[PDB]
Ligand binder design. Structure first.
Ligand SMILES: CCCCCCCCCCCCCCCCCC(=O)OC[C@H](CO[C@@H]1O[C@H](CO[C@H]2O[C@H](CO)[C@H](O)[C@H](O)[C@H]2O)[C@H](O)[C@H](O)[C@H]1O)OC(=O)CCCCCCCCCCCCCCCCC
Ligand code: CLA
Ligand code: CLA
Ligand code: CLA
Ligand code: CLA
Ligand code: CLA
Ligand SMILES: CCCCCCCCCCCCCCCC(=O)OC[C@H](COP(=O)(O)OC[C@@H](O)CO)OC(=O)CCCCCCCCCCCCCCC
Ligand SMILES: CC1=C(/C=C/C(C)=C/C=C/C(C)=C/C=C/C=C(C)/C=C/C=C(C)/C=C/C2=C(C)CCCC2(C)C)C(C)(C)CCC1
Ligand SMILES: CC1=C(/C=C/C(C)=C/C=C/C(C)=C/C=C/C=C(C)/C=C/C=C(C)/C=C/C2=C(C)CCCC2(C)C)C(C)(C)CCC1
Ligand SMILES: CCCCCCCCCCCCO[C@@H]1O[C@H](CO)[C@@H](O[C@H]2O[C@H](CO)[C@@H](O)[C@H](O)[C@H]2O)[C@H](O)[C@H]1O
Ligand SMILES: CCCCCCCCCCCCO[C@@H]1O[C@H](CO)[C@@H](O[C@H]2O[C@H](CO)[C@@H](O)[C@H](O)[C@H]2O)[C@H](O)[C@H]1O
Ligand SMILES: CCCCCCCCCCCCO[C@@H]1O[C@H](CO)[C@@H](O[C@H]2O[C@H](CO)[C@@H](O)[C@H](O)[C@H]2O)[C@H](O)[C@H]1O
Ligand code: OEX
Ligand SMILES: [Ca+2]
Ligand SMILES: [Ca+2]
Ligand SMILES: [Cl-]
Ligand SMILES: [Cl-]
Ligand SMILES: [Fe+2]
Lengths: 32, 135, 37, 450, 95, 37, 243, 30, 334
């Protein structure tokens, strides 16, 4: 079913969002 | 073994006519059983009155006998006492009374057929179906 | 029974009072380190 | 502010202690966290709305937030039937959006705002040792807490009412018109014993007493707020308490632990503020429901339910409480203090009345008793309903069970946190939280014990 | 030495339904009996012979035909209080 | 169920409540990004 | 009086174990016709004093009753009992208990530490007066007999799981000595008791009657393990006669 | 009379507790 | 100089052989009360109708018990959660029949142990110590409160409290497994990890220290005489111990820090006992252990049993046999 595909995609986007913020702040040397 | 055709072959009425549920109908009846019936009819017992259980001897002993699909469908539309004398439409969940039984109000005729079919198939998968409360 | 109840109520009230007024009696100052507070 | 061990003396695993004297970053921590609480409120409400089957009882469906909203009188009708799904959705959306606002504000103050607020404003900047400012903040927040209790009062009296399970005609949303302002009843609830038959404040059994208590709480909290804005701590309070940020934290921890225990017991026993139409039956309710169900069933078969002795010699269906009240038999003798709207019509002055049990039992009481005895708060951790010896076909654990277990555990761990922060506050104010000084070790100057 | 219900199990109580001692659950094997006609049998007990189960007041014609149809499944022994005191005929503690 | 015009976002709502848990995880990640100092 | 009181007024106060009292000291009477049945509505029975006939080692010493203290609490009253008072041709009044809460298990403590449980009951009490009564008054003494069922039912299990219609019939913990105990064979015989209800107060305006009772009945045999002791119970009673 | 033996062993344990506390070997720094 | 200040100085005195303190003013009376009543009831109390079914259970030594079978039996099921002090009984014999000594002993004991925890803080404060020994003692306190108070509150009867006896404790455990499947409850599993691991770490730590003691004696005298009480030097070689244990498994599995190691020793069984106390406290509200009965089905739908199903058969046996005259109705709901 396509419901669980979207659930996993929304979950994967939310999961990557936090480490993305950390990764852009570490890659550009922000106020970590 | 597999869930064969003969395991899903159950009596339809009292005249010897039989019916054979599909796998989809068996799974829909099992789902309706888990969602609606099991709070009192877990493993074929009756937690509120275990003199009248879902075991095959008890279903055969009802008046008229309820070990076929049509009698079970008639019971879930108009439930009676075990001798078929007292009106139990305000005491047993049924599709004819949505105002007091809203959980059954969206179940179609084929949904009642499937849950009746599952009620007939489940005793031959379990030797403890319809026994005592602790068993 | 009533005499026992009154005696037990008095005994419990006296011990609880001691605890409350004991911990109200500058108990932060009763320590071997600093006691200004 | 130091963000490492060499500059703070606190490790990473104790990092938030680096904020104790950084009031701006502390405020941002506090405000982002509130974001989180309002976020869970909104997102959990939207989840519960999305999974809700409204013709099915809420307690069958793993819901702990929609019962709270339904008890306030939103989206429900008689017998707690769901009229409209939109108030629950509205409560969810408003919390979720606001939580976005609160999260943005906490991030600001935490990452960009000034790390200390004392050089910026005297009203907002605080020193933990400044007893006037600490009581000012207590006072502002007390006026707000009293306003919240008065908002519950306003919802019950002026803006649509609350769900009363005890309402005549059946339980319904009703507007409270005569709240109990009598302080004898309101504070005699505080004076009642925390034991069987008395139940302290868990035994509040009517909405008039609840709404009147919140009028008094609102009045008490508003008056105590002004008190603490206008006043300073007195000498006995100054000499009795520890005055530090960790100390005030630990005082709040002990308070939170107490309210967590009270909440777990409240949801386990009380069916008025936690109506059984939304939360399911209490355990006492379900046991009395089983005894009533089999009283009715055997009476229909012609048993003399009053003259029937059981195997022990006590009455099988009816027996006497230790003070003499006519109560249900078997193990539910323990639960003879239970009161419920389905049961109280069959009760007389002496207890359960024989005439009402013979010729006043209605079919809805039988239906409710069967439903409540089969929805007893017994269940496995993987949500298998009923007794633990039952097989896997009934997916049910009561919301009362989930809420009570959660809050008991939370309450216990917050008592542990109280002990940890109180003890540490005492040691840090006394100066030996980092260990015994070797030169001035106090035991080396004490005399020997024997 | 046997207790009294064991000695009753030696009799015809241990083979078929006794209108004076059998619990209501034993009437479920006859079609149309549980719960109403069995309750009327238990309430109007005792009986000296099987035949006076037909002389219960308030029996309908269908109930009389059902009782006549299942007359051979019934026995009558002496009423034993060990099975009848405290309404064990209605609820003997068996579920 | 959600109201009908919101029902296209039923899966996203289904993953909404566990976002605070990730926040507890996220701090550890940030400490891992700075060396757990 | 607990007539205007509610449940919340009576609960946990012990007033649910006491029989209603005829407030009116009216020494009235209730007129009765010579072949009519009058129903008794809420017959209550409050035991107050408890005695057990002691069993001495001597055979010909006087037996005598010794007072016992109740260990069970305020759970010792019969109430909500329906009955019938029929008047025969010769004015003989007959009290006949029908149903209600007509039994309480009561455990009393004797001097010496012997605990005597007994099945205090008025079950199927039939009690006659002297002939020649035209009313119910202060001279009405219903003297008669009632049934005493066994204290333990036949579904009771002893601490070694032996009972009458359930449980073992032998001492299973001692496999070579299992059938050598007479306590393996349980029995529940039907005992008999004597009850005198002496009416002392008749309120003819509402048909209320009150008075005293003296009762004698056997005690618990523990499924026939021991011989029953004789228990004498004295107390007070109330009822409402339906004219 | 087995109760006498039980009371004796429990009393011996409690008396050992009393003597082990009130008349312990006192700890001394030397 | 005042009489009250002199009493405050005596109560809080570090020179007392047994420290009293303000928590001790509550602990000493309560614990002495519960100890006296427990000893008297364990020796001589008459049988208690625990289940409220007029079937009194003999618990004391004088009524035929031994030390193993003896107990102070819980209060009557008829009492439930009702407060039953001595003065609410019509006689002492009624109070004894209904299990009043259990309520007296339990309530005083529980106050006494909470004040024991507070007294541990109090003496740590008066000695200039760090204050968290009482946090460690909160784990046995939480377990005692779980079995004596919290489980009766959740089940609605002190009759469901753990009896004050050895075989009564076993009865409590067995009935608890029958009704809650505590073995399949992940928090008991943490308790067991707590006590098994705590004993493991007790043995490892003791063995590693005893293995690495500095030679200070002869082999005639006991090695314990190589330690002087109050000596400044360390009595064992932590580097040898670490060099042993980091070769027994590998180097970074071994503590080189004594403070880190001692923290771990304190923390592991305390956390485990906290978890199992919360398991019993949550099973009070019948949030039971894992139910995997008929979790596995063959393609037809026939049950394939597992070890959980055999465990469930054992749980049934206990359940249908326990309090065998108490139940009148098909479900054990509390
Ligand atoms: C500092 C503080 C020191 C204070 C010490 C004083 C003692 C406190 C503990 C009380 C002991 C409770 C024992 C019996 C509890 C009980 O009968 O029940 C609990 C009572 C509730 O009482 C119940 O209240 C009920 C009220 O409901 C009634 O009214 C309702 C109205 O809707 C319903 O109608 C319901 O059906 C009806 O019965 C009934 O009266 C019950 O009979 C009655 O038992 O809770 C209450 O009163 C209050 C909550 C009790 C304590 C909360 C838990 C505390 C646990 C701490 C553990 C810490 C561990 C840490 C270790 C380290
Ligand atoms: C409720 C959870 C919570 C909150 C609100 C805080 C808040 C704070 N911590 Mg603590 N912390 C927590 C949990 C929390 N912490 C936990 C669980 C640990 C253990 C791992 C720590 C360990 C810790 C240490 C060791 C330190 C702090 C410090 C701080 C402060 C400065 C943070 C900083 O410099 O980050 C900088 C980090 C970043 C810039 C990375 C990005 C962080 C942002 C917030 C991500 C937000 C993502 C979010 C989805 C975006 C939404 C935006 C909008 C739509 C709303 C800040 C007030 C520091 C301190 O004391 O300051 C003096 C410090 O040294 N914390
Ligand atoms: C007060 C807190 C609380 C309570 C009572 C509930 C209760 C419930 N939730 Mg909700 N939930 C909560 C918080 C809560 N939740 C939070 C914070 C989140 C976000 C992560 C969610 C997200 C959520 C979702 C997404 C769903 C639920 C669902 C449910 C239901 C089934 C729960 C279940 O199967 O659990 C299983 C039991 C466990 C997982 C056990 C967890 C044990 C914890 C970790 C122990 C912690 C102990 C202690 C605090 C640790 C401290 C350690 C240290 C101090 C030493 C139930 C009604 C489900 C439902 O039916 O909804 C319709 C569902 O789908 N909840
Ligand atoms: C408890 C929460 C709290 C507290 C105490 C503060 C305190 C402060 N903030 Mg912060 N802030 C918060 C939340 C908070 N803020 C949130 C949630 C946001 C995001 C919207 C911000 C965003 C923010 C910014 C961007 C700035 C501040 C600034 C300031 C400082 C100056 C305040 C000022 O000018 O007030 C005087 C202002 C008023 C009296 C008007 C506002 C009145 C409020 C907003 C209306 C009603 C409140 C609310 C809507 C009621 C419902 C709330 C609900 C949760 C119950 C002060 C230290 C400034 C700063 O850092 O100074 C250096 C600054 O630049 N704040
Ligand atoms: C949550 C809000 C809050 C907080 C944090 C405080 C905090 C404080 N208050 Mg304030 N107060 C509040 C609300 C609050 N109050 C309200 C709403 C009112 C109005 C009624 C007042 C009225 C008030 C007055 C009149 C006074 C204070 C004072 C104080 C200070 C000392 C209190 C103290 O030592 O208590 C410790 C408590 C005691 C020493 C009393 C011992 C009695 C025993 C221990 C009670 C045990 C009860 C038990 C634990 C729980 C049972 C629950 C229930 C049945 C009772 C402290 C700063 C005092 C002060 O310095 O004034 C400026 C003071 O005189 N408060
Ligand atoms: C609102 C309540 C509150 C507040 C504001 C604080 C605030 C603080 N605490 Mg305290 N604490 C509390 C409650 C609170 N605590 C409770 C209830 C307990 C008992 C368990 C403790 C026990 C405690 C100890 C033992 C210590 C502190 C310390 C501290 C300081 C540093 C904390 C830090 O950086 O954490 C960093 C955060 C982490 C390392 C992460 C914690 C991980 C937990 C175990 C997760 C629990 C699981 C959770 C339920 C979700 C499950 C997720 C799962 C699915 C994976 C800070 C001042 C420290 C201190 O004394 O500083 C002076 C310290 O050593 N706290
Ligand atoms: C030498 C005598 C040995 C007795 C052994 C008895 C069986 C014990 C089996 C368990 C093994 C576990 C030991 C691990 C511990 C271990 O490794 O032991 C070693 C230890 C000697 O070791 P060390 O020389 O290093 O001494 C350590 C000292 O520094 C002490 O701290 O032996 C003992 O302590 C005494 C022997 C145990 C004695 C225990 C008491 C037994 C007496 C009980 C009899 C009462 C019955 C009453 C009826 C009369
Ligand atoms: C500081 C810090 C921290 C913290 C942070 C925090 C705590 C935060 C937060 C935050 C928050 C608190 C947030 C938020 C948010 C929200 C949002 C973003 C929202 C929204 C919305 C929406 C978009 C919605 C939508 C919808 C609707 C409208 C309805 C329908 C459904 C849906 C869902 C679609 C940490 C730990 C990291 C550490 C470092 C530092
Ligand atoms: C709303 C409501 C209500 C009402 C309620 C009320 C009215 C209340 C209250 C409340 C209150 C009124 C409270 C309180 C409290 C208190 C506390 C909780 C305390 C305490 C304590 C402390 C904390 C102390 C401490 C100490 C000591 C002991 C001594 C030394 C010093 C110190 C400080 C340490 C009712 C129920 C009607 C109904 C329902 C709703
Ligand atoms: C030092 C700190 C404070 C301690 C001082 C307190 C002293 C004692 C106060 C209360 C003790 C006596 O309090 C009194 O107890 C009896 C119990 O027998 C209660 O009496 C209650 O039960 C008895 C049964 O015995 C009934 O007869 C009575 O009708 C009923 O009201 C009273 O209602 C109560 O007022
Ligand atoms: C509750 C009410 C508390 C009032 C008691 C004291 C009120 C004011 C008396 O004086 C206050 O307290 C002590 C005396 O005890 C003084 O010292 C403080 O400087 C003063 O703030
Ligand atoms: C300082 C107190 C510390 C505890 C010490 C007290 C116990 C020491 C022994 C003295 C006890 C004597 O007290 C007496 O004991 C006997 C034996 O159980 C009890 O007798 C009890 O048991 C026997 C048989 O088990 C029964 O026949 C008797 O009917 C029953 O009451 C008495 O009721 C009690 O009064
Ligand atoms: O008491 Mn003690 O064990 Ca709790 O579960 Mn119901 O109660 Mn009775 O049974 Mn099973
Ligand atoms: Ca349902
Ligand atoms: Ca979905
Ligand atoms: Cl048992
Ligand atoms: Cl029961
Ligand atoms: Fe060590």
């Amino acid at each position: 079913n396509l419901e669980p595909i979207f659930q996993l995609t929304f979950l994967g986007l939310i999961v990557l969002a936090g480490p993305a913020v950390v990764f852009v702040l570490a890659f550009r040397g922000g106020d970590l | 073994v597999e869930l064969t055709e003969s395991t899903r072959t159950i009596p339809l009425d009292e005249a010897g006519g039989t019916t054979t549920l599909t796998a989809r109908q068996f799974t829909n009846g099992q789902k309706i059983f888990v969602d609606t019936c099991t709070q009192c009819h877990l493993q074929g017992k009756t937690k509120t009155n275990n003199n009248v259980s879902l075991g095959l001897a008890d279903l055969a002993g009802a008046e008229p006998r309820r070990d076929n699909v049509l009698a079970l469908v008639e019971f879930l539309k108009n439930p009676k006492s075990y001798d078929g004398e007292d009106d139990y439409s305000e005491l047993h969940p049924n599709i004819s009374r949505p105002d007091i039984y809203p959980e059954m109000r969206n179940y179609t005729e084929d949904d009642i057929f499937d849950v009746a079919g599952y009620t007939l198939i489940a005793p031959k998968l379990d030797e403890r179906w319809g026994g005592t409360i602790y068993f | 029974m009533l005499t026992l109840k009154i005696a037990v109520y008095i005994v419990v009230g006296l011990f609880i009072s001691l605890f409350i007024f004991g911990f109200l009696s500058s108990d932060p100052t009763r320590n071997p380190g600093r006691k200004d507070f | 502010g130091g963000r490492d061990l060499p500059s703070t003396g606190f490790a990473w695993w104790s990092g938030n202690a680096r904020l104790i004297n950084l009031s701006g970053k502390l405020l941002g921590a506090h405000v982002a966290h509130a974001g989180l609480i309002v976020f869970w409120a909104g997102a959990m409400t939207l989840f519960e709305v999305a999974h809700f089957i409204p013709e099915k009882p809420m307690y069958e469906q793993g819901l702990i937030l929609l019962p709270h909203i339904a008890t306030l009188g939103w989206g429900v009708g008689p017998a707690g039937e769901v009229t409209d799904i939109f108030p629950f959705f509205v409560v969810g959306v408003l919390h979720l959006i606001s939580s976005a606002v609160l999260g943005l504000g906490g991030i600001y103050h935490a990452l960009r705002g000034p790390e200390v607020l004392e050089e910026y404003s005297s009203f907002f900047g605080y020193d933990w040792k400044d007893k006037n400012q600490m009581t000012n903040i207590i006072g502002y927040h007390l006026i707000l807490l009293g306003c919240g209790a008065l908002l519950l009062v306003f919802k019950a009296m002026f803006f649509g009412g609350v769900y009363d399970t005890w309402a005549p005609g059946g339980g319904d949303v009703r507007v409270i018109t005569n709240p109990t302002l009598n302080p004898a009843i309101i504070f005699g609830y505080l004076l009642k014993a925390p034991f069987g038959g008395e139940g302290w404040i868990i035994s509040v059994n009517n909405m008039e007493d609840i709404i009147g208590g919140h009028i008094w709480i609102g009045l008490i909290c508003i008056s105590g707020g002004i008190w603490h804005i206008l006043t300073k701590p007195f000498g006995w309070a100054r000499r009795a308490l520890i005055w530090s940020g960790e100390a005030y934290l630990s005082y709040s921890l002990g308070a939170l632990s107490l309210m967590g225990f009270i909440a777990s017991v409240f949801v386990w026993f009380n069916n008025t503020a936690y109506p059984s139409e939304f939360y399911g039956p209490t355990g006492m309710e379900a046991s009395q429901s089983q005894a009533f169900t089999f009283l009715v069933r055997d009476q229909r078969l012609g048993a003399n339910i009053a003259s029937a002795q059981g195997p022990t010699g006590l009455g099988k269906y009816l027996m006497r409480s230790p003070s003499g009240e006519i109560i249900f038999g078997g193990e539910t003798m323990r639960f003879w203090d239970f009161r419920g709207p389905w049961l109280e019509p069959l009760r007389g002055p002496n207890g359960l009345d024989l005439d009402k049990l013979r010729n006043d039992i209605q079919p809805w009481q039988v239906r409710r008793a069967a439903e409540y005895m089969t929805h007893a708060p017994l269940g496995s951790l993987n949500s298998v309903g009923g007794v633990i010896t039952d097989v896997n076909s009934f997916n049910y654990v009561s919301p009362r069970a989930w809420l009570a277990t959660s809050h008991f555990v939370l309450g216990f761990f917050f008592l542990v946190g109280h002990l940890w922060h109180a003890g540490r506050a005492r040691a840090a104010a006394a100066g030996f939280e980092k260990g015994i000084d070797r030169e001035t070790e106090p035991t080396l100057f004490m005399p020997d014990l024997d | 030495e046997l207790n009294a219900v064991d000695a009753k199990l030696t009799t015809d109580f241990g083979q078929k339904i006794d209108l004076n001692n059998s619990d209501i659950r034993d009437f479920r094997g006859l079609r149309g009996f549980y719960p109403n006609l069995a309750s009327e049998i238990i309430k109007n007990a005792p009986y000296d012979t099987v035949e006076e189960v037909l002389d219960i007041p308030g029996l309908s014609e269908t109930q009389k035909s059902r009782l006549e149809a299942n007359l051979g499944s019934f026995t009558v022994t002496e009423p034993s209080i060990e099975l009848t005191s405290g309404d064990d005929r209605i609820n003997p503690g068996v579920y | 169920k959600l109201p009908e015009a919101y029902q296209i976002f039923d899966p996203l709502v289904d993953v909404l409540p566990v976002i605070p848990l990730f926040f507890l995880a996220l701090a550890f990640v940030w400490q891992a990004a700075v060396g757990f100092k | 009086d607990k007539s205007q009181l509610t449940y919340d007024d009576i609960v946990n106060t012990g007033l649910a174990n006491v029989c209603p009292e005829i407030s009116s000291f009216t020494r009235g009477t209730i007129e009765v016709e010579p072949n009519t049945k009058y129903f008794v509505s809420d017959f209550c029975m409050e035991p107050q004093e408890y005695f057990v006939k002691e069993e001495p080692v001597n055979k010909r010493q006087k037996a005598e009753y010794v007072k016992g203290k109740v260990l069970t609490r305020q759970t010792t009253s019969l109430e909500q009992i329906r009955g019938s008072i029929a008047v025969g041709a010769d004015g003989t009044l007959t009290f006949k208990e029908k149903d209600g809460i007509d039994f309480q298990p009561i455990t009393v403590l004797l001097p010496g530490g012997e605990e005597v449980p007994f099945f205090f009951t008025v079950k199927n009490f039939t009690g006659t007066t002297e002939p020649g009564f035209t009313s119910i008054n202060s001279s009405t003494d219903f003297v008669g007999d009632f049934n005493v069922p066994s204290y333990r039912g036949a579904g009771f299990l002893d601490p070694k799981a032996r009972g009458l219609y359930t449980g073992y019939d032998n001492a299973v913990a001692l496999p070579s000595a299992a059938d050598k105990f007479r306590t393996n064979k349980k029995e529940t015989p039907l005992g008999k008791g004597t009850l005198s209800l002496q009416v002392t107060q008749v309120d003819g305006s509402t048909g209320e009657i009150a008075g005293i009772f003296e009762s004698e009945q056997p005690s618990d045999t523990d499924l026939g393990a021991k011989e029953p002791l004789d228990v004498k119970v004295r107390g007070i009673f109330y009822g409402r006669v339906d004219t | 009379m087995e109760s006498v033996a039980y009371i004796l062993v429990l009393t011996m344990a409690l008396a050992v507790l009393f003597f082990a506390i009130a008349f312990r070997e006192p700890p001394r720094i030397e | 100089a005042s009489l009250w200040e002199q009493f405050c100085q005596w109560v809080t005195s570090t020179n007392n052989r047994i420290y009293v303190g303000w928590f001790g003013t509550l602990m000493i009376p309560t614990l002495l009360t519960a100890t006296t009543c427990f000893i008297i009831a364990f020796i001589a109390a008459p049988p208690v109708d625990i289940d409220g079914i007029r079937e009194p259970v003999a618990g004391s030594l004088l009524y035929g018990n031994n030390i193993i079978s003896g107990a102070v039996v819980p209060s009557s099921n008829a009492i439930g959660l009702h407060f039953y002090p001595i003065w609410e009984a019509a006689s002492l014999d009624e109070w004894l029949y209904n299990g009043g000594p259990y309520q007296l002993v339990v309530f005083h004991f529980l106050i006494g142990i909470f004040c024991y925890m507070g007294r541990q803080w109090e003496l740590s404060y008066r000695l200039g110590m760090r204050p968290w020994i009482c946090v460690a003692y909160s784990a046995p306190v939480s377990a005692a409160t779980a079995v004596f108070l919290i489980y009766p509150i959740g089940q609605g009867s002190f009759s469901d409290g753990m009896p004050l006896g050895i075989s009564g404790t076993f009865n409590f455990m067995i009935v608890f497994q029958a009704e809650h499947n505590i073995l399949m409850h992940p928090f008991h599993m943490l308790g067991v990890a707590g006590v098994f691991g705590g004993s493991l770490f007790s043995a490892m730590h003791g063995s590693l220290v005893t293995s690495s003691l500095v030679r200070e004696t002869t082999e005639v005298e006991s090695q314990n005489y190589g330690y002087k009480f109050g000596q400044e030097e360390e009595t064992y070689n932590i580097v040898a111990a670490h060099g042993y244990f980091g070769r027994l498994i590998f180097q970074y599995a071994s503590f080189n820090n004594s403070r880190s190691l001692h923290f771990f020793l304190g923390a592991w069984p305390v956390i485990g006992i906290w978890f199992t106390a919360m398991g019993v406290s949550t099973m009070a509200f019948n949030l039971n252990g894992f139910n995997f009965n008929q979790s596995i089905l063959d393609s037809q739908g026939r049950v394939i049993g597992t070890w959980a199903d055999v465990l469930n058969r054992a749980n049934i046996g206990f359940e249908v046999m326990h309090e065998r005259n108490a139940h009148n109705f098909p479900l054990d709901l509390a």
